[PDB]
Structure 1
Amino acid sequence: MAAPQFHRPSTITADNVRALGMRGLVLATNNAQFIMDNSYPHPHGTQGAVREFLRGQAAALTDLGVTHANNTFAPQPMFAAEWLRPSFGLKRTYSPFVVRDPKTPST
């Protein structure tokens, strides 16, 4: 990244790295200045084509996926892969999934 580069998970520049969470990423990234190259004198080796961010910001939501809109043990996610589920074999086989979404844990 710009400033002091790291990609997930690191922190300076694109405020944070993967697993930072709802706040400090969003809050962090919101938090930075206009400048370019702060805290750093060099670019990403790959280039800045890869700043290893959305990968951390996406894996952040997977970490936030655990307790939001439901306690976790509560009735979330509602419809309850499986935004609305799928059906496997008529049984008599006993295992494997034939509908894109076999199930989504309700938690």
Structure 2
Amino acid sequence: APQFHRPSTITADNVRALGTRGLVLATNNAQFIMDNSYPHPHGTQGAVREFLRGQAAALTDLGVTHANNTFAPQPMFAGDAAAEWLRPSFGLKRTYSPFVV
């Protein structure tokens, strides 16, 4: 359980335990006054590295809830094929809508 109003509560497990939708609400409904009695031991800028790693992993969560909605990531570029001595490799310009009915 993280609490945003203090520096030394946020860890890597505390960001990823809440998803993308819930992190919209709890950060928009947090405390204005920042406490400073016991800061983050790696400095107050060290936890900036600690939170935001959980965001790009939080759409890998939303990638799984939409794995039944989006498509498998095809290689966007060439050079990525198991056989290159008889057939070439394309790469899909992913202009398409990842969308499964």
TM normalised by structure 2 equals 0.43
Structure 1 portions without partners, runs of 5+: 100-107
Structure 2 portions without partners, runs of 5+: none
Secondary structure of the residue aligned to 2:58 is helix
**Count, aligned residues:** 97
TM normalised by structure 1 equals 0.41
Q: Distance in 2 between matches of 1:22 and 1:13?
A: 17
In structure 2, the CA distance between the partners of 1:4 and 1:98, relative to structure 1 (3 Å rule), is closer
Is the 8 Å Cα contact of residues 70 and 76 (structure 1) preserved in structure 2?
no
Deviations along 1:28-47, one digit per CA (max 9) or x if unpaired, are 21221211127956564474
In structure 2, the CA distance between the partners of 1:76 and 1:95, relative to structure 1 (3 Å rule), is closer
Deviations along 1:43-67, one digit per CA (max 9) or x if unpaired, are 6447446351110111111111112
Is the 8 Å Cα contact of residues 5 and 12 (structure 1) preserved in structure 2?
yes
Q: Distance in 2 between matches of 1:96 and 1:11?
A: 37
Between Structure 1 and Structure 2, which shows a larger proportion of helix residues? Answer: 2
Q: Distance in 1 between matches of 2:11 and 2:37?
A: 8
Is the 8 Å Cα contact of residues 40 and 46 (structure 2) preserved in structure 1?
no
Q: In the TM superposition, what is the alpha-carbon distance from 1:94 to its structure 2 partner?
A: 28
In structure 2, the CA distance between the partners of 1:45 and 1:55, relative to structure 1 (3 Å rule), is same
Q: Which moved more, 1:88-97 or 1:65-74?
A: 88-97
Instruction: State the percentage of identical aligned residues.
Output: 99
Q: In the TM superposition, what is the alpha-carbon distance from 1:20 to its structure 2 partner?
A: 1.9
Root-mean-square deviation (CA), in Å? Answer: 11.2
